[model samples]
Target: SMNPPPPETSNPNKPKRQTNQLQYLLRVVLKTLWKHQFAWPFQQPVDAVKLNLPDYYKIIKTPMDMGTIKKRLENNYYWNAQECIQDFNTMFTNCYIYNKPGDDIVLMAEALEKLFLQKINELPTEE
Candidate 1:
C-alpha cells in the first residue's frame, strides 16, 4: 500500500511545494486562471472542488463538448487572457477527474522518513 512518488526537488524560482503530475497540470491551469483572474464569474473557488469531488462522478458525468473545444482552437483561442477566459475555464473545469486531486497528498511521516534517511525502521521481523 506504499504510494511513494518518484523523487523530485523543488525549484527555488517557483513556489515551495511537492511535485506530481496532477499538481503540475493543475498548477499550469491555475497559473493561467489567476493571470487572467480579473474576468471571472463569481468567486471561482476551486479548493473544495478539487479536494473532495469523487472520481466516479466525473467519469459518469457528461463529457466535454468537442465542438466548443475545437471552436476555441480554431480561433487560436487561448486561455491565457481575460476576454478569452472561457476556453481556459472550460479545460480546467473538465480535464481532471477522480483520484487526481488527492494524488501525492501529504506523505506518511514514517515512509517519508525511511525514504530520506535510507534506513527502514519499525518493521515486523521477516521470517
Candidate 2:
C-alpha cells in the first residue's frame, strides 16, 4: 500500500570540501620555501653539462627539484598532501645522495628541509 517506501535511505552525507583548502595551504608553504635563501640550489634541475658533473645522472636516477614539484602541484598531480610531502622528501634525498656532508649544497638542503617541516607542521588539520 505504500509507494515504494519513499526510496528509503540510511546513510548520512559527509562534507568533503577540504581538498582545495589543503592545496592552498600547501601552495603557501611551497612559496615560502621558494623565497628562502637556501632555495637557489634546489630551484631547478641540475645541469650536468654546465656543472661538468658527468656522473650526476648515473647516480641520481630520479632527480627532483622545486620547480618540477611546483609544476606537478599546479597540474594536480598530487592525490593528497602526503604525496606532495613525499616529493619534497625525494628532492632532499637526491641532494644528499649527490652532495657530501658539510658541502654547501648539502647544508642548504638540510636548512630547507628544516624549514619545510616547520611549515608543514603549521598547517591546520580538521579545520
| The candidate that achieves the highest TM-score relative to the unseen native structure | 2
- Model 2 regions lying over 4 Å from their true place: 1-22
Model 1 poorest 10 in a row by lDDT = 1-10
- Evaluated at residue 33, the lDDT of candidate 2 is 86
Give stretches of model 1 more than 4 Å off: 1-83, 104-127
Best by lDDT: 2
lDDT of 1 by residue, 33-104 (tens): 333423232123223344454443435243322233333333433323332234334333443442354344
Q: lDDT score of model 1?
A: 0.32
lDDT of 2 by residue, 5-57 (tens): 11111223422233653575457778988999889877777777768888888
